[PDB]
């Protein structure tokens, strides 16, 4: 019904995306070469979150993963080409209002 708040960052080989859903339930994640999809129910009220992220550059579903915690869901995506810089999470120049950079874990690794 509405995207989860998300924070994101990257490393040389990986792109990290923290979906900020506390006491989360029924967490589903789908990785595809050109896209991420995330959905879950929020722990306060069972409100359905859904985020579709048509990705800035290619990724590997076979080396990508997600960890659920009662604090947040962290996705770790494998860059399809290590050393690609990611100036934005999505192929579009869209200003997704729920998405920001994780400046506790952002580093200029390049």
């Amino acid at each position: 019904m509405q995207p989860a708040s998300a924070k994101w960052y990257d490393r040389r080989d990986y792109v990290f995306i923290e979906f900020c859903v506390e006491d989360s339930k029924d967490v589903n994640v789908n990785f595809e070469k050109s896209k991420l999809t995330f959905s879950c129910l929020g722990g306060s009220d069972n409100f359905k979150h859904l985020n579709e992220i048509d990705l800035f550059h290619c990724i590997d579903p076979n080396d990508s993963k997600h960890k659920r915690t009662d604090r947040s869901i962290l996705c770790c995506l494998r860059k399809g080409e290590s050393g690609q810089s990611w100036p934005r999470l999505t192929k579009e120049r869209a200003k997704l209002n729920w998405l920001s950079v994780d400046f506790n874990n952002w580093k200029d690794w390049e």
Binding site: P3, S5, P87, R88, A94, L96, N97, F103, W106, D108
Partner: protein, 628 residues
């Protein structure tokens, strides 16, 4: 296993927000002006799809209304307002932001951007407020007063007072020790510092005239944040009115860089070179930087030495960003690795500005006439950009007619035999240009760079090579001029026939020099004192002997070894040879050789270890000349 929700101790949590978050009380006015700017952004955005939202009032603005009689500061805006449920939720719940909960509802095409996100900044009103009343009127509900002294509770009531139509009106009843916020000069200071770029007119209501019943200072922000616009659409007049407004300068800017960075960081900046250097630019150790950092048009910090290197301190500028991490106070940035990435981009775009300015020779003269020290301090301190900065250098030279040339112009004139850039350092353009060291260089027509500020000596130590041409001081031992084999043979004959004189002069000048040598660098001077290569020149030695706060221990070994260079073609030196080879211990040779050494120390730009023992030689010669 038992599961529990986290709680909060609201009585002590409010005590944290009031007593511990904010290091200065003045910020209360930027938090309440930010909440008004967000309330105005919410109704502006709601009106775009439905003009009926403004039927209750069209004029989106902020009013500050200090009342010295009631010890009250009122902040009025014609923003979205709050329904009863929005008061009870957003002012009643600590760490709940109605701004975040609105922002996260919007589609990605929304052109709004709002300052609030923590859900705490309203509580900063209690830094200065004894009690706060928030009168409010949304479109979809009645007028209400919300009222609290932060005593763990707040009251809401239907408001029977003056009808607002639409807006909010934060009445701060101030503590008796905090009535300074009612002085119109105080409000002007705080609003100019924190909030001069808020996108809505902040009017201040001041006093009765001696008649205006209530004088408006029409806007406190009678300026626009032009840096949010596209740099192609702004003319140099528009940048000049902004530079004057940002700095309070009467004069224009010299040059401007306006750019954006996009990536993990997204930011915009205006960097201005001022017409003239501040008279205090390096004496004012407190104002380390002239860059202001903003987030969402609200001020964060300025005097952070991590934003630009100390050699760029003259650049007046603004950096602004949509999404940097803020400390809970909002008085600083939370992640120091962000300043490094800002600094990399600011410096790269400053050096773009200076190389784009260097294309325009008449404006580059006006620049370098005042910011030479900054480029040279950049070559002293910035090892990465040293190459880029070396092309910004301008110097007088023996081939340049009271005019300054770049190292690329020196290299354009270099003779095909030169593998080195010849430079001299000293006290004045006349003192270097007349010097003994350049006598054979100018005879060959070899060009020499004149270095004449004290900062040139700190600079040229790092400027070791340019375009693969080694910079060599003409005041250091074994200067290689592009001589012919016939000249090299004449130099070996000259070293041969004067070998004894150099030994005799080194006995007379013992400990006063490392050695005495026959030289290729002179023509008309009988001798000069050069230094060894690995130490301070005569100019670096005088400069370091004048730095008040330098430890004297380094001067005891960095002071280079003096070599006396003889001119073998001089009539004094040929006569001195004929005397020295007649008698090694002639008192008239002892006197001649030490008087030549002391005259060479002065000619070379050293000081004497005792000027009075030297002056007494001249006063004896004057007595003998006067026949006394």
């Amino acid at each position: 296993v038992e599961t529990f929700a986290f709680q909060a101790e609201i009585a002590q949590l409010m005590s944290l927000i009031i007593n511990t978050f904010y290091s200065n009380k003045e910020i209360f006015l930027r938090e309440l002006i930010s909440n008004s700017s967000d309330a105005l952004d919410k109704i502006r955005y709601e009106s775009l799809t439905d003009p009926s939202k403004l039927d209750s009032g069209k004029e989106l603005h902020i009013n500050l209304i200090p009342n010295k009689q009631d010890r009250t500061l009122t902040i009025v805006d014609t923003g979205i307002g709050m329904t009863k449920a929005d008061l009870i939720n957003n002012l009643g719940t600590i760490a709940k932001s109605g701004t975040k909960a609105f922002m996260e509802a919007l589609q990605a095409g929304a052109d709004i951007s709002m300052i609030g996100q923590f859900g705490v900044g309203f509580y900063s009103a209690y830094l200065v407020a004894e009690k706060v009343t928030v009168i409010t009127k949304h479109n979809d509900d009645e007028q209400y007063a919300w009222e609290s002294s932060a005593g763990g509770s707040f009251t809401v009531r239907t408001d029977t007072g003056e009808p607002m139509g639409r807006g909010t009106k934060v009445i701060l009843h101030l503590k008796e020790d905090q009535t300074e916020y009612l002085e119109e000069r105080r409000i002007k200071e705080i609003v100019k510092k924190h909030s001069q770029f808020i996108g809505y007119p902040i009017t201040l209501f001041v006093e009765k005239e001696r008649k205006e019943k209530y004088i408006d200072q029409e806007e406190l922000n009678k300026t626009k944040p032009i840096w949010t616009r596209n740099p192609d659409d702004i003319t140099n007049e528009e940048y000049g009115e902004f530079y004057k407004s940002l700095t309070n300068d009467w004069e224009d800017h010299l040059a401007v860089k306006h750019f954006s960075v996009e990536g993990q960081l997204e930011f915009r900046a205006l960097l201005f070179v001022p017409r003239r250097a501040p008279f205090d630019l390096f004496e004012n150790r407190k104002k380390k930087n002239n860059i202001k950092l903003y987030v969402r048009r609200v001020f964060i910090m300025d005097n952070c030495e991590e934003l630009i290197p100390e050699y760029l301190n003259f650049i007046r500028g603004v950096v602004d960003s949509e999404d940097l991490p803020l400390n809970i106070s909002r008085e600083m940035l939370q992640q120091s690795k962000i300043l490094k990435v800002i600094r990399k981009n600011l410096v790269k775009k400053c050096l773009e500005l200076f190389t784009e300015l260097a294309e325009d020779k008449e404006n580059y003269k006006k620049f370098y006439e005042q910011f030479s020290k900054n480029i040279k301090l950049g070559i002293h301190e910035d090892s990465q950009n040293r190459k880029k900065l070396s092309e910004l250098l301008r110097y007088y030279t023996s081939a340049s007619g009271d005019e300054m040339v770049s190292l690329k112009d020196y290299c354009t004139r270099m003779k095909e035999n030169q593998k080195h850039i010849y430079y001299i350092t000293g006290e004045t353009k006349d003192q270097v240009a007349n010097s003994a060291f350049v006598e054979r260089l100018r005879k060959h027509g070899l060009e020499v760079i004149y270095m004449i500020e004290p900062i040139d000596e700190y600079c040229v130590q790092q400027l070791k090579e340019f375009e693969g041409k080694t910079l060599v001081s003409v005041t250091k031992e074994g200067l290689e001029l592009p001589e012919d084999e016939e000249e090299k043979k004449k130099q070996e004959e000259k070293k041969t026939k004067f070998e004894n004189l150099c030994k005799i002069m080194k006995d007379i000048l013992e400990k006063k020099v490392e050695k005495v040598v026959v030289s290729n660098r002179l023509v008309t001077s009988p001798c000069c004192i050069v230094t060894s290569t690995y130490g301070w020149t005569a100019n670096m030695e005088r400069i370091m002997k004048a730095q008040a706060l330098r430890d004297n221990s380094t001067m005891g070994y960095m002071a280079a070894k003096k070599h006396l260079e003889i001119n073998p073609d001089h009539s004094i030196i040929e006569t001195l040879r004929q005397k020295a080879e007649a008698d090694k211990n002639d008192k008239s040779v002892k006197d001649l050789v030490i008087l030549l050494y002391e005259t060479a120390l002065l000619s070379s730009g050293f000081s004497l270890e005792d000027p009075q023992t030297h002056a007494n030689r001249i006063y004896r010669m004057i007595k003998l000349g006067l026949g006394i």
